[PDB]
Structures are given as structure tokens and as C-alpha cells.
Structure 1
Amino acid sequence: PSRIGLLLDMPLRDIERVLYFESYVVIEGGMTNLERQQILTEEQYLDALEEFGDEFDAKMGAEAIQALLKSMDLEQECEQLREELNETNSETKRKKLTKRIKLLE
């Protein structure tokens, strides 16, 4: 498994695309339609910034990954994930959240 992939909890395909400069990823993406870490195609990024030339940041590549990682709190995420793992559901999400919590702790 890829430690980045499941620490940040993003499918490895999308990090593969981002880290070789063929897409865009939002960093904070607040005060707008976008979420924390949506992926964008080049044209999608151009269109989004056109309609939303406000301050939402969407970077491209290693710098974006670094900012996204450095912009996270570990133990708080651990609390949220253990609360969610409390139940709903112990079928495969049980295994997934146990692994992610193991890495985070």
C-alpha cells in the first residue's frame, strides 16, 4: 500500500495524475462550490477560476501535495475517524478505518 495514498485517503490514481503535472487539486476550496480536495482537469480548472476568480487555491503537483499534507491535524483526524468507526459500518469500512487509524496513530 502507498502511505501517502491512505494517510491522505485519496485513490492512488489521482495522486499519480497530480504528481506528474496533468491535473489540478484544490487545497482549501472554501467559500465556493468546491470541496477540500476535488480533482480537476486543466480545462475544468480554467473554467472554475474563470467563474470563481476569487481566492480559492488549486495547485498542481508536488507543492500541492506538500501543502495539503502540512495542512492537516493528525490526532483530531484520529478522533473523527474513531468516532465514525464506532459503527456504520463493520463490513469493509471497519478494516479500512482500522488501517487508516493505525497509520495515523
Structure 2
Amino acid sequence: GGMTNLERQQILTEEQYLDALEEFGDEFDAKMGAEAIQALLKSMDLEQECEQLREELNETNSETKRKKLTKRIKLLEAFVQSGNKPEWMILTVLPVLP
């Protein structure tokens, strides 16, 4: 929901979500389940985020900016290079033992 004045990934409690839906109407969609996280991660292009993180690391340099960002880039590189789609982290079907 970009039309409404709300962040893409922000907390909106029950009363808050109620009043937001009452005011903005059926535009600021929200979910409260694991499927919410699944939708958040599936509709997210990894190459663009990787380029943005690389640009941020190259441009902005600080004691705290040097860390907490390179590991994110490494995780993104591992995900794209391994080919494992991150939606596979949230499992749908569950195996059981013989």
C-alpha cells in the first residue's frame, strides 16, 4: 500500500489497524500471520536490494555502518547464488519420519 501514508513494513496493532482501515478504506492491506511474512519476502527483488546495500556500504562508512551490512550482503549473495528461493524458508508441507 503506497497510496496511503503508511510504511511498507511497520507495526499496526488491532486498534491501530481498525482505525487505519476505517480511515483509508480497503487500501492499506494487512495480515497478522506467517503468510504475512511470506508475502513480505516473496514480493521482494533480491538483486535490487543487493545493489542498494552495496551502494550504501561503498558510500556510507562508519564504525557501525561497516558492520551489520556486509553480513546482509553475504546472505543475499548466498541466497542468489545457491538458487534457494527464500520463500522455501516458510514451509507449506511437513515431512514426517517412517
Question: Quick check: TM above 0.5?
Answer: yes
Identity of aligned residues (%): 100
List alignment gaps of at least 5 residues for structure 1. 1-28
Aligned to 1:76: 48
* Paired AA for residue 56 in structure 2: E
Q: Which protein is richer in strand relative to its size?
A: 1
| 1:67 and 2:42 matched | no
* Paired AA for residue 52 in structure 1: F
Aligned to 2:73: 101
Query: Normalization by structure 2: what TM-score?
Result: 0.73
| 1:40 and 2:12 matched | yes
Aligned equivalents of 2:70, 2:62: Cα separation in 1: 10
Query: Normalization by structure 1: what TM-score?
Result: 0.69
Q: Which consecutive segments of 4 or more residues in structure 1 shift more than 3 A? A: none
Aligned equivalents of 1:30, 1:86: Cα separation in 2: 29
CA RMSD across the alignment = 1.1
Q: Which has the larger radius of gyration?
A: 2
Contact 2:53 2:73 in 1 (8 A): yes
* Paired AA for residue 42 in structure 2: K
| 1:31 and 2:3 matched | yes
List alignment gaps of at least 5 residues for structure 2. 78-98
